[PDB]
Design a binder for these strands. Structure first.
Ligand code: 1F3
Ligand code: MG
Ligand code: MG
Lengths: 113, 117, 58, 127
RNA sequence: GUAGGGGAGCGUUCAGUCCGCGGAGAAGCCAUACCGGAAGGAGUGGUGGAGCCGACUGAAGUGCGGAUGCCGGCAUGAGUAACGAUAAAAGAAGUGAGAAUCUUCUUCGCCGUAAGGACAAGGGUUCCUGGGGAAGGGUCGUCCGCCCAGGGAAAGUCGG
RNA sequence: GCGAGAGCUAACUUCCGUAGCCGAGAGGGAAACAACCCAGACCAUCAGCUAAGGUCCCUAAAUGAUCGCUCAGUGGUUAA
RNA sequence: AAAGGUGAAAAGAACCCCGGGAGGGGAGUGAAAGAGAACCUGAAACCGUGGACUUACAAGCAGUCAUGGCACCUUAUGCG
């Protein structure tokens, strides 16, 4: 059959780049408009980065630095965002569905922190 | 001079096309098949004209021993009596009597039974 | 040449018969609570940009 | 009555609540699909549905509907809150033929079909 | 009743003669349950918008279902196969009637004895600027090698 | 079909003679079926008699009459 | 190669509405716009929209004949 669990519409290398790229964008911007699916897939990965950063020690930073290649974003996540989510029992990131696009007819969506 | 087709064909074509009234698909729409269908219809038309003449006699014969048997007779037997009573030359519309007027039909069954026995 | 090929033209009937399932389904449009311009269920209202509060610009 | 000659000058032939987008560069078949939902519906539902049918034929069709609406009001002085899609149909425009190249040297012909999208609005009237 | 022979005619164009018809509506087209033994031929209505039946005789590029017939239009296959290298992409900001596709920023990825750069051949204005947005662009374009207008090309020593 | 040869006293075989039909023959019959049986369609009828064939029901018309035979479904695959 | 046709005259449609436009509807011109510049007639194949009668136990050279049901009366109520 196919009872696995994850997505991949590209190849290993790329599936990672995308997740890391959208993870960097959401943390840079605070909210990003993307395809509904790409947004559904992004949600767990960014939520996981917030928890790693919630450590607040060097090891926790360097672990974020593995997926967040932008130096300024890693500082923002580490010193600004994770602290704010201290008492949030890791949940925050929400998805809003906008509606169908022109060229491909794809339903767009929002993903905000 | 030059004698072009213009009108002659279209008139002949529309004629055949109009014979094809409630013909299915292309048979009522395209000339070649419309005309083609009509050749076969021709066979059917000439045949069925003299075929209906067999069909009705059979319907009539059927209604006859239907009534003849109702009074304990049959077609073979009932018609033989009506033949023996020469006087009876009914033959045609002997089925209307059997269908519409039972009382009157009995009279003929009774008359046939006599001329026979 | 072009290996399997159709044997006869498919009639005006036959062709249209397979078309019986092509008819589009109109959206289930709902009236918007705070600008009334119709919206899709579970989507942000295109006119006011609301989804309980106003989420999107314009 | 008189004769035809006179009738032509006496009665001048009107198109109440009718509009047409002639020579629309889309395929009839494809365009019909959208028109098919809009037919019979009240000009406002028609307007609202079109904004959400995710088909590119939607824009052309919606435009005709607004022309038919405007015409119904401005020209024929009809009542807006009574307008409905009495009739809509897509007729085939002339085909833009184009020559596409295939394998081993052979050519083919692409038919870029065009549409004649006509929609006619009328007042409802139950009574 | 096949090949075939014989007979009687229907229809088309052109011509000559006669009789007429027509913008108060010709031909042609469309509908029709009427007529004649057939080919066929009328009446009526509709459309058309300027030519034209009927009769007698003459003449023919004179009657089509076929020829893998010729020209043209339009169907079926079917909303199907495909959309031309598996070197990706992501987001933000801008523009606009309209934006996955145009511009800008930041990343990402691919080539790097090349997928960078300079000629020659060949092409012929494709170059730059401003504007366009029907077709061309395998999708969309607000963009382009496309469309319009203006400009640009400078030799005693380079090549002839 | 009949009369012969060739052939295996095979062939929907071949080749002569002869008669018929099909070819160029519609109509009924033989389930279907060029040829066999009946019969040669000038047109019309919602009249009648017959032919070859038929008369349980499909399917027109006797589930007729008399004396018999056959119980194998023989009838509804051939021989020593 | 293929390609001809507004109208008698350009009087070639000012102005208003929907639309970026295309396209259309009006107003006006004209005898006619039932001639509007994809401009005489505008067949047929082919694509639709609307109405009548119909069709989801049916084996189909798609007709033909017979009958019944519905429907319509402009060579048309005995009949169609
Ligand atoms: C690849 C495409 C091309 O087709 C081809 O080449 C393929 C391979 C050929 O197949 C064949 O030969 N075989 C296929 C089956 C057996 C045979 C074959 C026999 C023996 C061997 N031996 C070994 C041991 O290998 C191999 C193949 C084609 C089909 C050929 O047709 C066959 O002809 C035989 C004579 C009679 C066959 N039937 C009728 C019995 C018939 O099938 C032929 C002649 O084309 C060559 C047709 C014409 C129409 C074309 O020319 C088209 C336009 C081609 N031209 C073009 O470019 O496209 C093509 C379609
Ligand atoms: Mg032909
Ligand atoms: Mg023996």
């Amino acid at each position: 059959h196919g009872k696995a669990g994850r997505k991949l519409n590209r190849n290993s290398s790329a599936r990672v780049a995308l997740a890391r790229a959208q993870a960097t964008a959401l943390l840079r911007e605070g909210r990003i408009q993307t395809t509904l699916t790409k947004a559904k897939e992004l949600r767990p990965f960014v939520e996981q980065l917030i928890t790693t950063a919630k450590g607040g020690d060097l090891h926790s930073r360097r672990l974020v630095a593995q997926d967040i290649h932008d130096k300024d974003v890693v500082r923002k996540v580490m010193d600004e965002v994770a602290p704010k989510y201290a008492e949030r029992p890791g949940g925050y990131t929400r998805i809003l569905r906008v509606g169908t696009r022109r060229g491909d007819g794809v339903t767009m969506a929002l993903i905000e922190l | 001079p030059r004698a072009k087709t213009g009108i002659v064909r279209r008139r002949r074509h529309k004629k055949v096309l109009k014979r094809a009234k409630g013909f299915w698909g292309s048979r009522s729409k395209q000339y070649r098949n419309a005309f083609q269908t009509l050749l076969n219809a021709a066979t059917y038309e000439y045949r069925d004209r003299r075929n209906k003449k067999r069909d009705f006699r059979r319907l009539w014969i059927q209604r006859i021993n239907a009534g003849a048997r109702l009074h304990g007779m049959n077609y073979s037997t009932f018609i033989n009596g009506l033949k023996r009573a020469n006087i009876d030359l009914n033959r045609k519309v002997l089925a209307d009597i059997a269908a519409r007027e039972p009382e009157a039909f009995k009279a003929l069954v009774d008359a046939s039974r006599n001329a026979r026995q | 040449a072009k290996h399997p090929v159709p044997k006869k033209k498919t009639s005006k009937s036959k062709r249209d018969m397979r078309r019986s399932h092509h008819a589009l389904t109109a959206p289930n449009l709902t009236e918007c609570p705070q600008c009334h311009g119709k919206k899709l269920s579970h989507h942000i209202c295109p006119n006011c940009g609301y989804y309980d509060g106003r989420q999107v610009l314009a | 009555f008189r004769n035809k000659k006179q009738r032509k000058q006496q009665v001048k032939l009107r198109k109440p609540g009718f509009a047409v987008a002639k020579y629309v560069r889309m395929s009839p078949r494809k365009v019909r699909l959208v028109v098919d939902v809009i037919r019979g519906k009240s000009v406002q539902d028609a307007e609202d549905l079109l904004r959400f049918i995710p088909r590119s034929a939607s824009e052309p069709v919606a435009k005709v509907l607004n022309s038919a609406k405007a015409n119904a009001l401005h020209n024929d002085e009809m009542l807006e809150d009574r307008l409905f899609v009495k009739e809509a149909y897509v007729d085939a425009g002339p085909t833009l033929k184009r020559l596409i190249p295939r394998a081993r040297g052979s050519a083919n012909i692409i038919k870029k079909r065009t549409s004649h999208i006509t929609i006619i609005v009328a007042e409802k009237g139950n009574k």
